[PDB]
């Protein structure tokens, strides 16, 4: 007789499903979340060229000597690292295409701005900010759906966890806990003279089906013997 | 003889754990997103809080007709659902004490535009919008403590989920699996007059330590018999 299908090799498959499945989820996860970390950041920044913009208008209404300066701060808040690493390939183009046409727009605005152009920088301002707003809620959309894919491959995990140790631990105590405790009993029955007891089943592809039948003959010898 | 020790219960026992290490893993890491899903959301109608309230001293220099609908607009914004939320068990303090700050210079400054009075708008919309962004930062922060611990979580969780694993396997494998392969062995050469074989090792506290002993009893006396 032979064992065809061997616990050893069943739960080694078992566990791995189990792991692999733990090690995508969390992998997966972790992937996005660092992605993520400093989208906070990026909305905040983002929208502080919204108000950086009105306030140059602000500036240049009330002939403000800060003028030059915030037209220096708002290039290096556009021009942040935060923001200068949204040019990056799991990025969606969106972001991307606004990101650029914000870009052009302050190289228009910042010439106007120096050369003191008031009356375009009133008839314009409006559709100016509207971009960056656009750009903002690009950021908080992309920010959404990706906290979102965290939450599906959280549930999935958790969910996925659960299914296969459900499954896994059926299958052990069908083929292995029960049957042993077969063996255990039929054993601790036969070493008393207890001889008239169901035979044990046999069907079992694994280590205790064979088990099953080397005590089926060791025992039905012995009863035969006294008996 | 007795079973001390049986597998079912082991067994039970570890992937309860390794479950309960899943399910409250998982549990945290939803509860905690699930409270964060509105968090860029929050950060970017704050953030616009900052413009708008530029825009109205914008609209005061320049005789804007929009000036009440656009402080309308505002306290609309202020009052949004994302962020009367905030006051809330689970949000920081720091965040929930900024937001009343704003709202109480909120009722200052729509008095004062109300008058026209631009003398002290000149002079104190650099203060105001300063509270404004550290209230934005505020909101950054926490978005990011929260976003870190789901990654705490996460990490932990499969670095737990993994360790678990190994040592249940291991368990498995050294109390289950190699003795069944002793037992399974024994039986096959027993079967085949081969008596001279090193005897089963008795001393595991679950079934197959009692398997074990019963075997060699059943072998002994054979070999004896015949031989």
């Given amino acids: 007789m032979i064992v065809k299908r061997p616990v050893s090799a069943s739960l080694a498959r078992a566990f791995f499903y189990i792991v692999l499945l733990s090690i995508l989820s969390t992998g997966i996860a972790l992937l996005t979340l660092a992605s993520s970390l400093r989208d906070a950041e990026a909305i905040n920044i983002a929208g502080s060229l919204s108000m950086q913009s009105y306030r140059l208008g602000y500036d240049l209404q009330s002939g403000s000597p800060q003028l030059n300066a ?35 727009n302050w190289l228009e605005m910042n010439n106007r701005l120096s050369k003191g152009d008031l009356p375009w920088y009133q008839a314009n301002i409006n559709n100016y900010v509207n971009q960056i707003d656009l750009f903002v809620l690009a950021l908080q959309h992309y920010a959404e759906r990706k906290m979102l894919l965290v939450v599906a491959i959280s549930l999935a995990g958790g969910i996925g966890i659960f299914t296969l140790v459900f499954f896994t631990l059926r299958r052990i105590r069908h083929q292995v806990v029960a049957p042993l405790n077969q063996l255990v009993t039929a054993s601790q029955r036969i070493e008393h003279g207890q001889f008239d007891s169901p035979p044990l089943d ?21 009863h035969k013997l006294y008996r």
């Fill in 202 to 222: 046999t069907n079992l592809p694994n280590e205790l089906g064979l088990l099953a039948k080397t005590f089926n003959q060791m025992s039905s010898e012995l």
């Fill in 70 to 104: 915030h037209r220096q701060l708002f290039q290096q808040a556009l021009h942040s690292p935060v923001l200068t690493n949204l040019n990056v390939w799991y990025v969606p183009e969106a972001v991307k295409t606004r990101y650029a046409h914000l870009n052009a």
